[PDB]
Design a protein around this ligand. Sequence first.
Ligand SMILES: [Zn+2]
Length: 25
Amino acid sequence: NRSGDTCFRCGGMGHWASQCPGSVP
Ligand SMILES: [Zn+2]
């Protein structure tokens, strides 16, 4: 958002890699 917070785990951004949605796809 206001930083280079590119979420490398999901390929998205805005959140940290450990918080990617994947419990219930
Ligand atoms: Zn993510």
